[PDB]
């Protein structure tokens, strides 16, 4: 039957996911709880600890310090920006691994990513979150929810909606194999604005959706309507990307000291 093909698709996606995303949910949960037995992320809970562990790495990542003169809120907000930039590239790599994606019209590929990357970023952000904080720098750091919320307006609440989403989403207990297919389904959304050829996209998504359904039935036998609940989360993620686009407008009304990374400028352009 075609069920075997659906399991092969699910496995292929999982393997690609492992290859594309350095910090898996499995590894994240281990850190957030206990088993790291090697990690021990630096905890940032206030201004003092922030200074102390401004990632601490002398600074090996690209773009040295000197990001200074800019207040804490702006620096943290820009840090999230560069994280997204990295994430967009990991996600693009992943999307190109989905059977049929690279054969789609190139402009539609751009459109699918443009409208899909943030939805995926917030989905995976949940993997690194618990009710008290979020892992940063591949688990080398942990910033508390309370700290992020203490940031001056309008920065003190850009993370709050994500944490709220995460708590409910994580309650569903999806694992990396589930997430790989879930993410693929989000990317292949035929209702993105401006798509040229909707049919080929829907064909691919219908198959991914069947694969997701079977994956949930086998991997979460006793989870009633997990599939139905998951589809709903799809629409919720939509709301977060729009809710965030707003706060991003209120921000450019006061700080002409922000400046958005070119890749994010392109993605946000005429998004919503």
């Amino acid at each position: 039957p075609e069920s075997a093909d659906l399991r092969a698709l699910a496995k292929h996606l999982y393997d690609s996911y492992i290859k594309s995303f350095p910090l898996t949910k499995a590894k994240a949960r281990a850190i957030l709880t206990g088993k790291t037995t090697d990690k021990s992320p630096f905890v940032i809970y206030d201004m003092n600890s922030l200074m102390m562990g401004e990632d601490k790495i002398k600074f090996k990542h690209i773009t040295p310090l000197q990001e200074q003169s800019k207040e804490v809120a702006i620096r943290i907000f820009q840090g999230c920006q560069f994280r997204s930039v990295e994430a967009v590239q990991e996600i693009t790599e992943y999307a190109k691994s989905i059977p049929g994606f690279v054969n789609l019209d190139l402009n539609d590929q751009v459109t699918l990513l443009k409208y899909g990357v943030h939805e995926i970023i917030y989905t995976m952000l949940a993997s690194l979150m618990n009710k008290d904080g979020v892992l940063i720098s591949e688990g080398q750091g942990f910033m508390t929810r309370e700290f992020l919320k203490s940031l001056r307006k309008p920065f003190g609440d850009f993370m709050e909606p994500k944490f709220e989403f995460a708590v409910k989403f994580n309650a569903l207990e999806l694992d990396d194999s589930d997430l790989a297919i879930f993410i693929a389904v989000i990317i292949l959304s035929g209702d993105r604005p401006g798509l040229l050829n909707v049919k080929p996209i829907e064909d691919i998504q219908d198959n991914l959706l069947q694969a997701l359904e079977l994956q949930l039935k086998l991997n979460h036998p006793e989870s009633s309507q997990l599939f139905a609940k998951l589809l709903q989360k799809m629409t919720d993620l939509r709301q977060i990307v729009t809710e965030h686009v707003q706060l991003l407008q209120v921000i450019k009304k006061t700080e002409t000291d922000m400046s958005l990374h070119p890749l994010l400028q392109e993605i946000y352009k005429d998004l919503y």
Partner: peptide, 12 residues
């Protein structure tokens, strides 16, 4: 000008 297009076109 499209960075996404460029990233999509590079050899995996």
């Amino acid at each position: 000008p499209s960075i996404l297009k460029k990233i999509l076109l590079e050899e995996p």
